[PDB]
Amino acid sequence: VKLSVEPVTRVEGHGKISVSFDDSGNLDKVRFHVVEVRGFEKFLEGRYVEDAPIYTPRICGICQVAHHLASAKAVDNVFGVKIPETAELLRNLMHQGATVHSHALHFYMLAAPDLMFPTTDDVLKRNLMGIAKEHPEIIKDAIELRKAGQNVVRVVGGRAIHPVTAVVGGQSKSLKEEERDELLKLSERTIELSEKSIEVGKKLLENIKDEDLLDIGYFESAHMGMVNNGVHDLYDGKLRVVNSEGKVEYEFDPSEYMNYIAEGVKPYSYLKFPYLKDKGEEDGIYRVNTLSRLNVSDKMATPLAQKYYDEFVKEFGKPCHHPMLFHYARLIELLSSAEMVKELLENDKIVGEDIRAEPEEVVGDGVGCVEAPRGTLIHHFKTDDDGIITDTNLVVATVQNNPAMDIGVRKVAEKYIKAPEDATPQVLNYMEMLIRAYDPCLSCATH
Amino acid sequence: EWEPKIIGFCCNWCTYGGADTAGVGRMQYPPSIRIIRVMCSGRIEPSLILKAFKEGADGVFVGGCHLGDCHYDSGNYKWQRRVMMLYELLEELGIEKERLNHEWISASEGEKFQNTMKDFYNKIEALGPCKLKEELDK
Amino acid sequence: VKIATTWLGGCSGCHISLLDLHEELLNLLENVELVHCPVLMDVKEIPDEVEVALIEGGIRNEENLEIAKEMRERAKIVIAFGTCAAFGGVPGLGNLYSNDELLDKAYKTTITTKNDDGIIPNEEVPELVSRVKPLSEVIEVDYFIPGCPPNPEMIAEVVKALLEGKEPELPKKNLCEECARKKSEEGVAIETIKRNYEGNPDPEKCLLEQGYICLGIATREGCGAPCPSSGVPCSGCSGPTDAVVDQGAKMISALCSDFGIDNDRDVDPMILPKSIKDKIGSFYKFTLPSAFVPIRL
Ligand code: NFU
Ligand code: SF4
Ligand code: SF4
Ligand code: SF4
Ligand code: FES
Ligand SMILES: [Fe+3]
């Protein structure tokens, strides 16, 4: 007997789950398959390097800002140019606003339907329309958060989806004093709604705990995230890796990522299986984003988020390996990003006119790195003396959570499925809930 | 077993007359080409040549007045700038530069037109068929 | 009114622009009956009797082809949702290489890839189609919403017109209309061609007249021209107007015509081809699959 969950819904991209049974009717193989690939790494060859921040956002419509900025950083390294401080603040403001939009989008429109209705037979109710009918306030708040995030991106990036201001040497336009004032006034409401969102999460995750679903897909692994002097940072710093017990294995500059990360290939998925080179395929499994970033960080960079982080650490410890608690970690980051938008808008250097540095002589190699809302994002480009791309490598966030998703769906089936009859619509949805906990972006992951 | 499919674009004042002269003088040449009439070579743009290759052309020929002798004074200078870019674009698309041929032939140059048709035909016959349409029809 | 959506070889950006309707999304969803949308609901199969269908992305693999054909049979009206579905989009640049080259790079030669047996995923995954194709090349498309992604207002305008029973109408002019940059009354004249990083562009003058390859002249309006307003040239993400089939060919025609027009008889015709080292990437970023020559042989 062979069952297939396709397509996996309320996830970005194309994925599917296969569940097979042996001749006796016992659970045999459970796999997570990603059924798409576009080949961005190869088709970027021959393109102008300065055009990478125009092409990479098209890898994903949700986290297009992360790609635009990761590409811009790689391009800045190819030209050997250090951008002015105002440009760094504008790029970070754009990045923080995009994180607010992405985290709010996933938690409310993709994850909340299962956290609110984890044991429903009504499939037509498990979505944002179903939540809006009984709790309209929750969806209005989600929309207002997304609107605030996208507005910051639209103003600093020029476009809400696929921004264009991060150019060689800095930004193509400056933030005007009147624009900065408007965004700063609107920034306070985003922080309030983010605090409100964390409380909605506590309640919904309590409901999940009551149904014995808080430990679905549980397994222990290493965790990776960017840190700036040990502080949680989504824009600048070094990449830190902690083992399953919280011990820092290593800390490295993103330009040396090829000496620590490896990507395996399995015949049943277009999504690769990364791991820590020194440890291997099984002992070197690691996770990225939200909870993994909280696990590697000494503390948060903002005060309100730090308070929820302290309360969470005291209750679940460090490191927390629970896939479902990635939902809670996501809400803490949603607040930290909202707080950072305000913090960056309060920095007088944000409205400066020295936004660009003249491109220096070309260097045929540049690595760009940022923490995309779904994990560590690395854009690596190699070019010729004319600045034409010759080789590229993209290690895109969710790919690093592929092993965790494949293991997790197997663990969910092991817990609830013994025979084909046990695979009820609700139990099949439990497997998708584990997938959703990681906020996967499958178009992103395969690129 | 195979004959090249060549499309031609000739200006009404010079190359069209040059092709007529070749005909009046019974100047024989291969029957692969099919000529399209325009008033000036300045009417020719990348879109018409790329469209021809899409349709299955093995070779594309363009004929205009001599530089400085355009019936409309300078239409051929714009086409000359367009064709130089088009030659390199074809190479980037895997189409041999040699599959496109542009020449300056007057209304009195029947013999030159005949030899240009013979040379272009021989060039395309040697290259073999352009497999674009076959790749697109897959 | 039963409405459905699906995605093929795109990035989800068109669906995100639909969500960028914000408060208006709820007003829209109360009028229409959403019966299938992978990103928002769990209805797995496309149901029968769909009145309007929004299909995002172009055709990249065999599954996209099946879904496109299935949605066409179930929906009365099919809409090519976004530049990928209408013209092929950025993934279309993959047509400049063979599928084996795209796959060998992603699963073998990338610096971090470890593939011992040297295999390409082939189990429970669909094969790639020979080349990226716009939706209209495989199924009958009734309407299309251009843009990468289309602005949220345009998406609502098109959908609203179809709910009322009216025929949707898209803007017809090129981008210079909406662009706030000042043009020379004497006409456009290009002296030299520069790459976007060369020099410091004047914020008031037309970028094309300054020597930058701006696609605004060969691109449909509607976006509000945010790129030139932000200090960078238009990349042509909205595609061509209704009177132009091959955007790149027409952009090349215009650029070549005005290059050295003040010195027309003496300007060297080899400066322009020599100055542009990436032609396809300069003129076919978002429309290569819809071009007359949509692949590299
Ligand atoms: N967040 C995010 Fe992307 Ni749609 C993923 N996965 C990128 O780096
Ligand atoms: S048209 Fe643009 S935004 Fe829409 S799916 Fe394609 S790349 Fe994404
Ligand atoms: S900058 Fe581009 S869109 Fe604006 S007027 Fe010049 S060519 Fe047109
Ligand atoms: S200016 Fe050009 S590239 Fe930018 S959004 Fe408009 S159509 Fe797209
Ligand atoms: S008329 Fe012959 S080229 Fe202008
Ligand atoms: Fe990759």
mmCIF file of N, CA and C in Angstrom, chain A residues 7 9-12 14 16 31 33-35 37-38 42-43 45-48 50-51 55 58 61-62 110 123 126-127 143 146-147 150 158-159 161-162 172-173 257 261-264 267-270 272 275 356 386-388 393 432, chain C residues 7-8 10-13 16-17 19-20 22-23 38-42 44 60-61 93-94 96-97 101-102 105-107 110-114 121-126 128 148-149 195 197 199 226 230 232 276-278 281-282 285-286:
data_model
loop_
_atom_site.group_PDB
_atom_site.id
_atom_site.type_symbol
_atom_site.label_atom_id
_atom_site.label_comp_id
_atom_site.label_asym_id
_atom_site.label_seq_id
_atom_site.Cartn_x
_atom_site.Cartn_y
_atom_site.Cartn_z
ATOM 1 N N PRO A 7 -0.548 18.216 -3.143
ATOM 2 C CA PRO A 7 0.669 18.903 -2.690
ATOM 3 C C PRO A 7 0.628 19.190 -1.198
ATOM 4 N N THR A 9 0.207 21.544 1.526
ATOM 5 C CA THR A 9 -0.392 22.867 1.484
ATOM 6 C C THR A 9 0.032 23.746 2.639
ATOM 7 N N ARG A 10 -0.139 25.056 2.452
ATOM 8 C CA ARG A 10 0.212 26.092 3.419
ATOM 9 C C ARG A 10 1.708 26.110 3.704
ATOM 10 N N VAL A 11 2.469 26.025 2.614
ATOM 11 C CA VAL A 11 3.926 26.064 2.576
ATOM 12 C C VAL A 11 4.207 26.771 1.276
ATOM 13 N N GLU A 12 5.365 27.399 1.141
ATOM 14 C CA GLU A 12 5.671 28.055 -0.116
ATOM 15 C C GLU A 12 6.369 27.002 -0.960
ATOM 16 N N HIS A 14 6.608 23.682 -3.962
ATOM 17 C CA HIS A 14 6.164 22.347 -4.329
ATOM 18 C C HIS A 14 6.823 21.198 -3.572
ATOM 19 N N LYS A 16 5.891 17.186 -1.307
ATOM 20 C CA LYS A 16 4.951 16.078 -1.120
ATOM 21 C C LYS A 16 5.488 15.058 -0.131
ATOM 22 N N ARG A 31 8.845 9.519 3.316
ATOM 23 C CA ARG A 31 9.792 10.503 2.799
ATOM 24 C C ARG A 31 9.166 11.818 2.419
ATOM 25 N N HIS A 33 9.395 14.805 -0.249
ATOM 26 C CA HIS A 33 9.928 15.097 -1.579
ATOM 27 C C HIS A 33 9.665 16.523 -2.006
ATOM 28 N N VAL A 34 10.671 17.170 -2.595
ATOM 29 C CA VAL A 34 10.555 18.528 -3.112
ATOM 30 C C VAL A 34 10.624 18.281 -4.607
ATOM 31 N N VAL A 35 9.557 18.632 -5.311
ATOM 32 C CA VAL A 35 9.417 18.374 -6.739
ATOM 33 C C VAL A 35 9.631 19.558 -7.689
ATOM 34 N N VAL A 37 12.729 22.613 -9.340
ATOM 35 C CA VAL A 37 14.075 23.159 -9.481
ATOM 36 C C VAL A 37 14.078 24.052 -10.725
ATOM 37 N N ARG A 38 14.745 25.215 -10.643
ATOM 38 C CA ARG A 38 14.816 26.158 -11.768
ATOM 39 C C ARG A 38 16.231 26.344 -12.325
ATOM 40 N N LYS A 42 23.296 27.936 -12.290
ATOM 41 C CA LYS A 42 23.926 27.805 -13.596
ATOM 42 C C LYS A 42 23.524 28.929 -14.551
ATOM 43 N N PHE A 43 22.225 29.301 -14.611
ATOM 44 C CA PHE A 43 21.830 30.352 -15.545
ATOM 45 C C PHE A 43 22.359 31.746 -15.164
ATOM 46 N N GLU A 45 25.399 32.262 -14.686
ATOM 47 C CA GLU A 45 26.681 32.312 -15.397
ATOM 48 C C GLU A 45 26.470 33.045 -16.713
ATOM 49 N N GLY A 46 27.326 34.014 -16.999
ATOM 50 C CA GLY A 46 27.230 34.802 -18.217
ATOM 51 C C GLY A 46 26.518 36.122 -18.001
ATOM 52 N N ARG A 47 25.862 36.291 -16.836
ATOM 53 C CA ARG A 47 25.145 37.524 -16.527
ATOM 54 C C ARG A 47 26.085 38.541 -15.906
ATOM 55 N N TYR A 48 25.705 39.826 -15.947
ATOM 56 C CA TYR A 48 26.519 40.879 -15.342
ATOM 57 C C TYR A 48 26.408 40.650 -13.841
ATOM 58 N N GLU A 50 26.572 42.842 -11.408
ATOM 59 C CA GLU A 50 25.739 43.888 -10.798
ATOM 60 C C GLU A 50 24.237 43.622 -10.980
ATOM 61 N N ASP A 51 23.857 42.697 -11.888
ATOM 62 C CA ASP A 51 22.452 42.355 -12.124
ATOM 63 C C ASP A 51 21.989 41.196 -11.227
ATOM 64 N N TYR A 55 18.069 39.449 -10.376
ATOM 65 C CA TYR A 55 17.664 38.073 -10.643
ATOM 66 C C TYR A 55 17.363 37.240 -9.397
ATOM 67 N N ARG A 58 13.923 36.945 -7.580
ATOM 68 C CA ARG A 58 12.958 36.091 -8.276
ATOM 69 C C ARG A 58 13.059 34.615 -7.862
ATOM 70 N N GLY A 61 9.233 34.990 -3.859
ATOM 71 C CA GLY A 61 8.371 36.146 -3.691
ATOM 72 C C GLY A 61 8.117 36.569 -2.258
ATOM 73 N N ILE A 62 8.487 35.731 -1.277
ATOM 74 C CA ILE A 62 8.291 36.054 0.139
ATOM 75 C C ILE A 62 9.545 36.699 0.715
ATOM 76 N N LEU A 110 -0.293 30.663 7.370
ATOM 77 C CA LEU A 110 0.090 29.278 7.090
ATOM 78 C C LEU A 110 0.076 28.355 8.302
ATOM 79 N N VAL A 123 -11.925 20.567 6.365
ATOM 80 C CA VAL A 123 -10.735 21.024 5.654
ATOM 81 C C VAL A 123 -10.925 22.471 5.200
ATOM 82 N N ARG A 126 -9.765 25.019 7.886
ATOM 83 C CA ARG A 126 -8.341 25.126 8.181
ATOM 84 C C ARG A 126 -7.578 26.067 7.242
ATOM 85 N N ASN A 127 -7.853 27.369 7.356
ATOM 86 C CA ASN A 127 -7.204 28.398 6.542
ATOM 87 C C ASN A 127 -7.518 29.796 7.114
ATOM 88 N N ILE A 143 -2.743 41.207 8.888
ATOM 89 C CA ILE A 143 -2.720 42.075 7.718
ATOM 90 C C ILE A 143 -2.007 43.390 8.030
ATOM 91 N N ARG A 146 1.815 42.761 8.250
ATOM 92 C CA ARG A 146 2.350 42.556 6.907
ATOM 93 C C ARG A 146 2.419 43.886 6.164
ATOM 94 N N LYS A 147 1.346 44.685 6.256
ATOM 95 C CA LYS A 147 1.266 45.993 5.601
ATOM 96 C C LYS A 147 2.371 46.925 6.111
ATOM 97 N N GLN A 150 5.807 45.479 4.662
ATOM 98 C CA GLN A 150 5.895 45.740 3.222
ATOM 99 C C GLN A 150 6.037 47.232 2.929
ATOM 100 N N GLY A 158 12.089 50.574 -2.775
ATOM 101 C CA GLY A 158 11.476 51.052 -4.014
ATOM 102 C C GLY A 158 10.258 50.231 -4.403
ATOM 103 N N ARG A 159 10.282 48.911 -4.106
ATOM 104 C CA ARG A 159 9.186 47.990 -4.405
ATOM 105 C C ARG A 159 8.996 47.059 -3.220
ATOM 106 N N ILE A 161 7.769 44.004 -3.315
ATOM 107 C CA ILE A 161 8.181 42.682 -3.761
ATOM 108 C C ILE A 161 9.234 42.913 -4.845
ATOM 109 N N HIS A 162 10.445 42.404 -4.611
ATOM 110 C CA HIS A 162 11.593 42.528 -5.503
ATOM 111 C C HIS A 162 12.149 43.963 -5.434
ATOM 112 N N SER A 172 20.800 53.207 -4.136
ATOM 113 C CA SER A 172 20.524 54.036 -5.310
ATOM 114 C C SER A 172 19.757 55.316 -4.933
ATOM 115 N N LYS A 173 19.112 55.325 -3.753
ATOM 116 C CA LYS A 173 18.371 56.485 -3.273
ATOM 117 C C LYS A 173 18.442 56.549 -1.748
ATOM 118 N N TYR A 257 32.187 29.558 4.615
ATOM 119 C CA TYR A 257 31.098 28.575 4.691
ATOM 120 C C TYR A 257 31.397 27.233 3.995
ATOM 121 N N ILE A 261 30.181 23.674 5.714
ATOM 122 C CA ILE A 261 28.921 23.128 5.215
ATOM 123 C C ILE A 261 29.110 22.287 3.973
ATOM 124 N N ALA A 262 28.330 21.212 3.874
ATOM 125 C CA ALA A 262 28.334 20.305 2.732
ATOM 126 C C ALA A 262 26.877 20.026 2.403
ATOM 127 N N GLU A 263 26.563 19.735 1.143
ATOM 128 C CA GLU A 263 25.194 19.458 0.724
ATOM 129 C C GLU A 263 25.106 18.127 -0.007
ATOM 130 N N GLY A 264 24.425 17.169 0.607
ATOM 131 C CA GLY A 264 24.245 15.849 0.035
ATOM 132 C C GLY A 264 23.084 15.797 -0.933
ATOM 133 N N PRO A 267 18.304 10.549 -4.293
ATOM 134 C CA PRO A 267 17.526 10.432 -5.538
ATOM 135 C C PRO A 267 16.040 10.762 -5.484
ATOM 136 N N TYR A 268 15.443 10.843 -4.298
ATOM 137 C CA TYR A 268 14.005 11.118 -4.198
ATOM 138 C C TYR A 268 13.598 12.578 -3.979
ATOM 139 N N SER A 269 14.526 13.536 -4.098
ATOM 140 C CA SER A 269 14.152 14.933 -3.904
ATOM 141 C C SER A 269 15.096 15.897 -4.597
ATOM 142 N N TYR A 270 14.545 17.004 -5.120
ATOM 143 C CA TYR A 270 15.352 18.026 -5.779
ATOM 144 C C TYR A 270 15.959 18.896 -4.677
ATOM 145 N N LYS A 272 18.402 19.360 -1.601
ATOM 146 C CA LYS A 272 19.611 18.741 -1.069
ATOM 147 C C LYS A 272 19.532 18.550 0.438
ATOM 148 N N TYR A 275 24.771 19.237 5.847
ATOM 149 C CA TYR A 275 25.306 18.722 7.110
ATOM 150 C C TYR A 275 26.642 19.382 7.427
ATOM 151 N N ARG A 356 26.437 56.040 -1.128
ATOM 152 C CA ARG A 356 27.158 55.179 -2.049
ATOM 153 C C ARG A 356 28.647 55.499 -2.123
ATOM 154 N N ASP A 386 35.903 41.396 -16.393
ATOM 155 C CA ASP A 386 34.835 42.288 -16.859
ATOM 156 C C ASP A 386 33.624 42.303 -15.906
ATOM 157 N N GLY A 387 33.604 41.429 -14.908
ATOM 158 C CA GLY A 387 32.496 41.369 -13.966
ATOM 159 C C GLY A 387 31.350 40.505 -14.457
ATOM 160 N N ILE A 388 31.642 39.541 -15.339
ATOM 161 C CA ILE A 388 30.639 38.625 -15.880
ATOM 162 C C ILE A 388 30.748 37.359 -15.050
ATOM 163 N N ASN A 393 27.146 29.806 -6.299
ATOM 164 C CA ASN A 393 26.694 28.789 -5.360
ATOM 165 C C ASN A 393 25.751 29.458 -4.400
ATOM 166 N N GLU A 432 2.038 17.231 7.903
ATOM 167 C CA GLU A 432 2.175 18.532 7.252
ATOM 168 C C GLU A 432 2.433 19.623 8.294
ATOM 169 N N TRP C 7 0.162 27.577 -8.831
ATOM 170 C CA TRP C 7 1.473 28.096 -9.170
ATOM 171 C C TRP C 7 2.267 27.044 -9.902
ATOM 172 N N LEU C 8 3.085 27.468 -10.860
ATOM 173 C CA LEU C 8 3.878 26.550 -11.652
ATOM 174 C C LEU C 8 5.385 26.827 -11.503
ATOM 175 N N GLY C 10 7.078 29.643 -11.108
ATOM 176 C CA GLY C 10 7.350 30.975 -10.586
ATOM 177 C C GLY C 10 8.023 30.969 -9.226
ATOM 178 N N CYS C 11 7.832 32.052 -8.458
ATOM 179 C CA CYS C 11 8.440 32.218 -7.129
ATOM 180 C C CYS C 11 7.447 32.483 -5.998
ATOM 181 N N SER C 12 6.121 32.502 -6.279
ATOM 182 C CA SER C 12 5.051 32.785 -5.304
ATOM 183 C C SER C 12 4.786 34.303 -5.164
ATOM 184 N N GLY C 13 5.631 35.144 -5.771
ATOM 185 C CA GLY C 13 5.506 36.597 -5.705
ATOM 186 C C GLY C 13 4.187 37.169 -6.178
ATOM 187 N N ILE C 16 1.827 36.579 -3.391
ATOM 188 C CA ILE C 16 2.127 37.515 -2.301
ATOM 189 C C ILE C 16 1.579 38.911 -2.652
ATOM 190 N N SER C 17 1.633 39.313 -3.934
ATOM 191 C CA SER C 17 1.106 40.619 -4.326
ATOM 192 C C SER C 17 -0.418 40.613 -4.139
ATOM 193 N N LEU C 19 -1.934 38.976 -1.779
ATOM 194 C CA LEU C 19 -2.116 39.143 -0.335
ATOM 195 C C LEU C 19 -1.836 40.591 0.050
ATOM 196 N N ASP C 20 -1.040 41.316 -0.768
ATOM 197 C CA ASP C 20 -0.722 42.722 -0.511
ATOM 198 C C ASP C 20 -1.917 43.644 -0.783
ATOM 199 N N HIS C 22 -4.212 43.456 1.266
ATOM 200 C CA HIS C 22 -4.362 43.650 2.698
ATOM 201 C C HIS C 22 -5.818 43.584 3.154
ATOM 202 N N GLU C 23 -6.411 44.715 3.558
ATOM 203 C CA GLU C 23 -7.797 44.749 4.027
ATOM 204 C C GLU C 23 -8.743 44.406 2.893
ATOM 205 N N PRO C 38 -3.229 26.361 -3.122
ATOM 206 C CA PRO C 38 -2.261 25.644 -2.275
ATOM 207 C C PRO C 38 -1.628 26.429 -1.129
ATOM 208 N N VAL C 39 -1.242 27.690 -1.351
ATOM 209 C CA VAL C 39 -0.617 28.486 -0.290
ATOM 210 C C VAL C 39 -1.574 28.844 0.859
ATOM 211 N N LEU C 40 -2.896 28.974 0.605
ATOM 212 C CA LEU C 40 -3.836 29.339 1.680
ATOM 213 C C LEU C 40 -4.740 28.234 2.191
ATOM 214 N N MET C 41 -5.098 27.237 1.365
ATOM 215 C CA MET C 41 -5.994 26.179 1.838
ATOM 216 C C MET C 41 -5.536 24.790 1.468
ATOM 217 N N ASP C 42 -6.141 23.786 2.108
ATOM 218 C CA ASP C 42 -5.786 22.378 1.928
ATOM 219 C C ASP C 42 -6.593 21.581 0.906
ATOM 220 N N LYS C 44 -6.638 19.662 -2.011
ATOM 221 C CA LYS C 44 -5.566 19.048 -2.804
ATOM 222 C C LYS C 44 -5.788 19.001 -4.305
ATOM 223 N N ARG C 60 7.929 24.789 -16.346
ATOM 224 C CA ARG C 60 9.318 24.386 -16.098
ATOM 225 C C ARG C 60 9.467 22.853 -16.063
ATOM 226 N N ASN C 61 8.449 22.114 -15.581
ATOM 227 C CA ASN C 61 8.528 20.649 -15.521
ATOM 228 C C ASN C 61 7.225 19.988 -15.977
ATOM 229 N N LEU C 93 15.763 32.309 -18.246
ATOM 230 C CA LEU C 93 17.184 32.424 -18.584
ATOM 231 C C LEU C 93 17.850 31.045 -18.592
ATOM 232 N N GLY C 94 17.195 30.053 -17.979
ATOM 233 C CA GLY C 94 17.691 28.683 -17.945
ATOM 234 C C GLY C 94 17.745 28.102 -19.343
ATOM 235 N N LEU C 96 19.126 29.289 -21.753
ATOM 236 C CA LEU C 96 20.435 29.580 -22.327
ATOM 237 C C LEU C 96 21.392 28.415 -22.107
ATOM 238 N N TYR C 97 20.929 27.377 -21.405
ATOM 239 C CA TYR C 97 21.705 26.180 -21.111
ATOM 240 C C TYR C 97 20.807 24.976 -21.259
ATOM 241 N N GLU C 101 22.869 20.742 -17.927
ATOM 242 C CA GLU C 101 23.816 21.724 -17.395
ATOM 243 C C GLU C 101 23.248 22.375 -16.136
ATOM 244 N N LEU C 102 21.940 22.696 -16.141
ATOM 245 C CA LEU C 102 21.293 23.312 -14.978
ATOM 246 C C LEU C 102 21.314 22.330 -13.813
ATOM 247 N N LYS C 105 24.955 21.360 -12.357
ATOM 248 C CA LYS C 105 25.499 22.404 -11.487
ATOM 249 C C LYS C 105 24.886 22.327 -10.098
ATOM 250 N N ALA C 106 23.562 22.254 -10.034
ATOM 251 C CA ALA C 106 22.849 22.194 -8.763
ATOM 252 C C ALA C 106 23.081 20.921 -7.967
ATOM 253 N N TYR C 107 23.238 19.770 -8.633
ATOM 254 C CA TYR C 107 23.426 18.506 -7.913
ATOM 255 C C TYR C 107 24.806 17.852 -8.033
ATOM 256 N N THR C 110 28.365 22.252 -7.764
ATOM 257 C CA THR C 110 28.337 23.397 -6.835
ATOM 258 C C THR C 110 29.409 23.085 -5.770
ATOM 259 N N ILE C 111 30.200 24.086 -5.351
ATOM 260 C CA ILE C 111 31.295 23.890 -4.379
ATOM 261 C C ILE C 111 30.932 23.101 -3.100
ATOM 262 N N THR C 112 29.751 23.310 -2.518
ATOM 263 C CA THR C 112 29.374 22.592 -1.299
ATOM 264 C C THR C 112 28.700 21.250 -1.547
ATOM 265 N N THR C 113 28.374 20.920 -2.798
ATOM 266 C CA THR C 113 27.706 19.654 -3.080
ATOM 267 C C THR C 113 28.603 18.421 -2.969
ATOM 268 N N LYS C 114 28.085 17.391 -2.286
ATOM 269 C CA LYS C 114 28.737 16.099 -2.070
ATOM 270 C C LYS C 114 27.802 15.032 -2.675
ATOM 271 N N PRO C 121 18.514 13.761 -8.944
ATOM 272 C CA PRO C 121 17.228 13.288 -8.414
ATOM 273 C C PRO C 121 16.291 12.869 -9.542
ATOM 274 N N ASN C 122 15.690 11.689 -9.412
ATOM 275 C CA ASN C 122 14.786 11.150 -10.437
ATOM 276 C C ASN C 122 13.624 10.319 -9.884
ATOM 277 N N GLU C 123 13.558 10.103 -8.564
ATOM 278 C CA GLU C 123 12.496 9.311 -7.956
ATOM 279 C C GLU C 123 11.452 10.230 -7.328
ATOM 280 N N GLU C 124 10.177 10.051 -7.702
ATOM 281 C CA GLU C 124 9.063 10.848 -7.183
ATOM 282 C C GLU C 124 9.203 12.356 -7.461
ATOM 283 N N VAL C 125 10.012 12.741 -8.469
ATOM 284 C CA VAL C 125 10.205 14.146 -8.845
ATOM 285 C C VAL C 125 9.931 14.234 -10.349
ATOM 286 N N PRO C 126 9.338 15.331 -10.848
ATOM 287 C CA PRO C 126 9.051 15.408 -12.280
ATOM 288 C C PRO C 126 10.242 15.825 -13.116
ATOM 289 N N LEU C 128 12.161 17.858 -16.107
ATOM 290 C CA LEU C 128 12.050 19.229 -16.579
ATOM 291 C C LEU C 128 11.599 19.179 -18.022
ATOM 292 N N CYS C 148 5.998 41.796 -12.568
ATOM 293 C CA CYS C 148 6.812 40.887 -11.775
ATOM 294 C C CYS C 148 7.032 41.396 -10.355
ATOM 295 N N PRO C 149 6.024 41.304 -9.474
ATOM 296 C CA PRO C 149 4.667 40.803 -9.702
ATOM 297 C C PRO C 149 3.751 41.959 -10.110
ATOM 298 N N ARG C 195 27.453 50.602 -17.961
ATOM 299 C CA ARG C 195 26.835 49.558 -17.166
ATOM 300 C C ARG C 195 26.281 50.304 -15.956
ATOM 301 N N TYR C 197 26.712 50.291 -12.849
ATOM 302 C CA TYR C 197 27.632 50.734 -11.794
ATOM 303 C C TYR C 197 28.559 51.875 -12.244
ATOM 304 N N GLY C 199 29.795 55.440 -13.323
ATOM 305 C CA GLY C 199 29.396 56.820 -13.078
ATOM 306 C C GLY C 199 28.382 57.003 -11.965
ATOM 307 N N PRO C 226 8.650 52.610 -10.471
ATOM 308 C CA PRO C 226 9.381 52.818 -9.212
ATOM 309 C C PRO C 226 10.894 52.695 -9.339
ATOM 310 N N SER C 230 13.591 55.449 -8.151
ATOM 311 C CA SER C 230 14.505 55.033 -7.085
ATOM 312 C C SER C 230 15.997 55.159 -7.446
ATOM 313 N N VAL C 232 17.529 53.685 -10.423
ATOM 314 C CA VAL C 232 18.073 52.603 -11.250
ATOM 315 C C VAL C 232 17.250 52.452 -12.520
ATOM 316 N N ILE C 276 28.423 45.939 -24.995
ATOM 317 C CA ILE C 276 27.464 45.083 -24.278
ATOM 318 C C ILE C 276 27.988 43.654 -24.294
ATOM 319 N N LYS C 277 28.528 43.192 -23.162
ATOM 320 C CA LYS C 277 29.079 41.839 -23.060
ATOM 321 C C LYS C 277 28.040 40.769 -22.697
ATOM 322 N N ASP C 278 26.844 41.183 -22.248
ATOM 323 C CA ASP C 278 25.764 40.259 -21.902
ATOM 324 C C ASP C 278 24.510 40.843 -22.531
ATOM 325 N N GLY C 281 20.976 38.874 -21.331
ATOM 326 C CA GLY C 281 20.688 39.298 -19.969
ATOM 327 C C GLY C 281 20.301 40.760 -19.884
ATOM 328 N N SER C 282 20.727 41.568 -20.855
ATOM 329 C CA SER C 282 20.399 42.995 -20.871
ATOM 330 C C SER C 282 19.012 43.260 -21.455
ATOM 331 N N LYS C 285 15.670 39.693 -19.755
ATOM 332 C CA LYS C 285 15.647 39.237 -18.362
ATOM 333 C C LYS C 285 14.378 38.477 -17.987
ATOM 334 N N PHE C 286 13.225 39.061 -18.291
ATOM 335 C CA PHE C 286 11.922 38.494 -17.949
ATOM 336 C C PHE C 286 11.100 37.937 -19.090
#
